[PDB]
């Protein structure tokens, strides 16, 4: 009857909000094309390092701290006389030192969303040059390969140390006194035990904020390693998009899917939400038992040491 107002009342505002937004998005689009295009030009040249080699060396960072190497920096280690020596970052200051770093996150300078073969071999930067020095004393972001990790853990009893930090400066740990990773023919199966620490036992127990079945499908202990081109997760699905490594965005010991996601996506500032995430899930450098699903750490690292 009179409702015909909305024809020269509402309608014309509806069209007013919509049209505005529409033309604002247009201008963001071309501003993004213009950032991506400036970055393509920078990617015409690479970044460089000059990492001179410490004289001191050994089987892993614990034998090196025993041989006098007391500063944290890149070292060459030869775990086995059959393998060629290779580069690693050695943390000589936390928990008495002698820690061989295996994974490191701190800024978001490396892509962690990779295939099976790069996760097998290793990727990223082990170390970068300290301001004005001929040696690399600062750690970069990296993943040591999975075959190197598996050999380090099967040489003897090995402890694992996981350290993290939020965007305000708080710091916690998750320490596992027993840590092993099988070889490739066993899909790099993980096994951990003897938990201690403040972060929360995500690997062995699952996200403490979920109950029952919802908790146990988030256990990482006993899982296989999965990548986006190789599904060994604990989720039996028929849709090819439904893979923990495709959503979640890294390479990891996923189980339907996780309580911890180191190797996740680096969100600047900490907080993120479902509608910021590529697939609507809690991708992000997460440790559920500490800050839940929707907070991504500032720093996250994994390192090992013989135990003894």
């Amino acid at each position: 009857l009179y409702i015909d107002e909305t024809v020269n009342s509402n309608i014309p505002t509806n069209l007013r909000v919509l049209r505005s937004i529409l033309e604002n998005l247009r201008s963001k689009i071309q501003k993004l094309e213009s950032d991506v295009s400036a970055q393509m030009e920078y990617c015409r040249t690479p970044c460089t390092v000059s990492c001179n080699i410490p004289v001191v060396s050994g089987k892993e960072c614990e034998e090196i701290i025993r041989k006098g190497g007391e500063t944290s920096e890149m070292y060459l280690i030869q775990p086995d006389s059959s393998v060629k020596p290779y580069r690693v970052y050695c943390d000589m200051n936390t928990e008495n030192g002698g820690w061989t770093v295996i994974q490191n996150r701190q800024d978001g300078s490396v892509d962690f969303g990779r295939k099976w073969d790069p996760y097998k071999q290793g990727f990223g930067n082990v170390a970068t040059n300290t301001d004005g020095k001929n040696y690399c004393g600062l750690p970069g972001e990296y993943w040591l390969g999975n075959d190197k990790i598996s050999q380090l853990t099967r040489m003897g009893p090995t402890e694992l140390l996981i350290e993290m930090e939020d965007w305000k400066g708080d710091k916690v740990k998750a320490h596992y006194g027993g840590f092993t990773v099988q070889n490739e023919a066993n899909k790099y199966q993980i096994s951990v035990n003897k938990y201690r620490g403040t972060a929360g036992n995500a690997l062995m127990d699952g996200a403490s904020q979920l109950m029952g079945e919802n908790r146990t499908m988030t256990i990482h202990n006993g899982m296989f390693f999965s990548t986006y081109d190789r599904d060994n997760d604990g989720w039996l699905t028929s849709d090819p998009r439904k893979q923990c490594s495709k959503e979640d965005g890294g390479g990891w010991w996923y189980n339907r899917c996780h309580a911890a996601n180191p190797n996740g996506r680096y969100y600047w500032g900490g907080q993120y939400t479902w509608d910021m995430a590529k697939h609507g899930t809690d991708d992000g450098v997460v440790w559920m038992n500490w800050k839940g699903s929707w907070y991504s750490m500032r720093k996250m690292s994994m390192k090992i040491r013989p135990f003894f």
Partner: peptide, 4 residues
């Protein structure tokens, strides 16, 4: 990270 769970999937109901």
């Amino acid at each position: 990270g769970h999937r109901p």
